Design a protein around this ligand. Structure first.
Ligand SMILES: Nc1ncnc2c1ncn2[C@@H]1O[C@H](COP(=O)(O)OP(=O)(O)O)[C@@H](O)[C@H]1O
Ligand SMILES: Nc1ncnc2c1ncn2[C@@H]1O[C@H](COP(=O)(O)OP(=O)(O)O)[C@@H](O)[C@H]1O
Ligand SMILES: [Mg+2]
Lengths: 99, 50, 148, 98, 50
């Protein structure tokens, strides 16, 4: 447990990396696409962070609409994630000053 | 531990959905589903979960 | 209380939580409350005893499954280590209740192991909302003809 | 923290003669968004902060402190050792062989 | 960060060491080092932090 916590997610690093990806693509990008292009090692918390940024900038999320994704762990275990439907936009996220 | 949920929803009733409208800071209609095998509500400080 | 301890069955006995050794069976802690304790340890004491009492109350006599099964835990594990929250969840599972945890994004890796959905809540200005999420395991095979 | 910072400043002095302020259960209810502001205000008032956490928000401590005291239980005796963040990182890397 | 850390050690006393002996569960002598810039004490629940 000590080293699991010591290996915890660095939120700000993900903030910056997602910003760089949004700058590179410069188009609406779904959560599953962000998962595929930025495979997280803390999948659930990273998805929570992503929806957090989406809502902070005012980018609404269509809860009733469903998209899917696939991920894996260091021990070979694989999980299928059911997610909402939304699209990030670089301009709105950049306009927001992050903490 | 997780797979023991098979008895839940068969021997007893369990919460599966919630609905809000003009409650607290939740203006207008809102909805949230709850899964059979347990769930967690997550957000920042003062988000509204309590 | 003077008359209660004569006419009320509930006051004819005095309760006390106890810790038993699994192997020998010798009691180590005749905990009558939670005075002292580390906190987190206090939390597990409280959670264990309260879930036990809830199962008692919600169950008709002679029923192994309470007809109502859900329990809510605000600020769950807010001051308990992963090792303690794990056993708290284990006790909740043994009693058979379906647990709704709430946390301010803390111990995320722990809920990851013992839940299958999440409800994100976020605030902006004078308004707030929620959104739904879920996940599962593809148990069919980690990797065909590999090590598993 | 503001009240303590004022209280510990000797008359006619802008900095507290005593600087160490403890925080048990430092951030048991605060997300990073709030804990960052807590840290900023705590450092602004001139105090040097000692924090305690039972393995929660480990990343945040790494970002505003330079050494950690790792205390572990064993039966009825508890041991304490003091290390730096980088020595602990090297120790984790050694466990990275697993 | 060290630019703000110049205040510590210069103007005010700062904690740097604690020594125990047979205090609680700490049988025998012990000691912990506190860095002038800030320290974080960590461990499993109920081990000796408090
Ligand atoms: N009755 C109230 N009194 C004071 N503030 C309130 C009240 N109701 C709502 N608030 C505001 O709405 C939110 C309610 O608390 P909440 O967001 O649910 O806490 P948390 O997210 O930590 O669980 C807070 O942001 C609070 O500022
Ligand atoms: N004076 C005491 N009273 C009650 N319990 C004590 C006492 N001293 C030690 N203990 C035991 O040693 C530990 C002391 O609590 P502690 O670990 O320091 O709290 P925390 O985990 O919140 O920092 C606990 O595990 C407790 O079981
Ligand atoms: Mg303590």
């Amino acid at each position: 447990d000590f080293w699991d916590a010591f290996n915890g997610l660095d939120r700000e690093v993900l903030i910056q990396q997602t910003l760089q990806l949004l700058a590179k693509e410069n188009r609406p990008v779904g959560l599953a696409e962000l998962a595929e292009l930025l495979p997280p090692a803390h999948d659930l918390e990273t998805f929570a962070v992503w929806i957090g940024m989406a809502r902070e900038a005012g980018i609404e999320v269509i809860d009733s609409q469903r998209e899917f994704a696939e991920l894996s762990d260091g021990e070979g275990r694989r999980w299928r994630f059911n997610l909402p439907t939304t699209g990030l936009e670089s301009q709105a996220l950049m306009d927001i000053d992050w903490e | 531990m997780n797979q023991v949920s098979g008895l839940a929803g068969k021997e007893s009733f369990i919460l599966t959905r919630i609905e809000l409208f003009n409650w607290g800071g939740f203006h207008g209609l809102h909805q949230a589903a709850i899964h059979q095998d347990g769930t967690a509500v997550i957000g920042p400080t003062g988000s509204g979960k309590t | 209380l003077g008359a209660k301890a004569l006419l009320d069955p509930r006051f004819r006995l005095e309760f006390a939580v106890s810790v038993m050794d699994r192997q020998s069976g010798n009691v180590i802690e005749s905990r009558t409350g939670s005075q002292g304790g580390s906190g987190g340890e206090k939390e597990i004491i409280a959670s264990y005893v309260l879930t036990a009492s809830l199962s008692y109350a919600l169950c008709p006599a002679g029923s192994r499954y309470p007809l109502f099964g859900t329990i809510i835990l605000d600020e769950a594990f807010s001051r308990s280590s992963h090792a303690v929250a794990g056993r708290i969840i284990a006790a909740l599972r043994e009693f058979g209740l379906h647990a709704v945890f709430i946390t301010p994004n803390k111990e995320m890796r722990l809920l990851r192991d013992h839940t299958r959905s999440a409800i994100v809540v976020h605030r902006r200005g004078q308004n707030s909302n929620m959104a739904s999420l879920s996940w599962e395991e593809l148990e069919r095979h980690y990797q065909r003809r590999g090590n598993a």
